[model samples]
Target: SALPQGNMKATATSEHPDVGNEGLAKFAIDGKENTIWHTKYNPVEELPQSITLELGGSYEINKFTYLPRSGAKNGNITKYELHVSEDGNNFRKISEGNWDDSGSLKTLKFNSTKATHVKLVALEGVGGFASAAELNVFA
Candidate 1:
């Protein structure tokens, strides 16, 4: 079944900004493929940044979708860890592993759980930076 959409707030460890464009964390949930949540271009040693999403309320999340940056050069997440929380403070690791550089919508399914917060930690990226065009959580 489709999950009811609600107000979702996003926060990240870091964001990239430019003269005219801002790669804010909110872009990942903006429902636009053109917008993205981009982390600062950092060395490989300083990677593993994370983005957290507050679902506004608790819901059963059985799966989620991740959309890599539209451009192949923008970098795709290669490894990541997903966590879910009910109290917004404590989180339990739900899944962690390597993700292929498919430059397409990648759906990750897991055991259904009631959660109000979801977090994605990018352990590695294809181009030394992590980027995502959109993130959708489903019931």
Candidate 2:
């Protein structure tokens, strides 16, 4: 995939409401390889988890990707749905499918569309939890 690296700046936020110190929502987009963003483990949150990213500016995003934690152990997603919104309040789902565990980068594709926000919904995953080592969007 082509990364419009210098074309835009963006930040991510989560709805989990339970990011452990090591799994803060921002970690997913900090361009880091080791840090991961995971649901709270102490209380344990079940699947149907969701994460969102707001692009600094609206642009055509054709593809996005997800990376599991470094160890490739926990937070291995089994299924997912990708959605985008020109406005943050409402989103349109563009893709949904099953993704096997302990694999390479999970890249999702779509036709170019103008979007200011992107949301990834973890419908089902391992141990009834979700985590992302990294997530990205590019033209």
Candidate 3:
């Protein structure tokens, strides 16, 4: 339904501020700081790490990608599972799989009907330090 218009003018302004790899969330490994956005990879020993997104309400997710870092040789991740919850507290597994050891980037795909908070749990990994450069989640 359309509402009656009354001084409904909208405006957008661009500062034209130029920036590249300047902010905290750049793709470069050294650039990510405390930013809320960007890829994240936690240890398999910790198993799962909960993720919260600012996307209001529930939504479905289709895929996620993970890139192993150079330091991951000691604690390589073998498999992982995705879990979701409407409330951030409790969670249930929505997808699970083994990491592709392929020379290319690793990818995982799954379909969720509804979810608010998401988590990725590692099923297998070596002891000691584990590393991942980035984790891409798509909805």
* TM-scores of all candidate predictions against the true structure: 0.89, 0.85, 0.54
Off by over 4 Å in 1: 1-6, 18-22, 42-45
Residue 71 in candidate 2 has what lDDT? Answer: 64
Greater lDDT among 1 and 3 belongs to 1
Error in Å for residue 128 of model 1: 1.3
Task: State the TM-score for model 2.
Answer: 0.85
* Best-to-worst TM-score order: 1, 2, 3
Worst 10 residues of 1 by lDDT: 14-23
Using lDDT as the measure, the top candidate is: 1
| Per-residue lDDT of 134 in model 2 | 78
List clashing residue pairs in candidate 1: none
lDDT (10s digit) by residue, model 3, range 27-120: 2123232211112323122433222322245667666555554423433456767676777667788788776543245777676446655555
Clashing residue pairs in candidate 2 are none
lDDT of 2 at 54: 78
- Report RMSD for candidate 3: 12.0
lDDT (0-100) at residue 73 of candidate 2?
A: 64
Model 3 lDDT-worst window of ten:
7-16
Give per-residue CA lDDT, model 2, range 1-139, as digits (tens): 5444344343433323433435777777777768777866667777777888877678888998888887656777889999888988889998899898874788888888888888888887788778888788988
lDDT of 1 at 70: 78
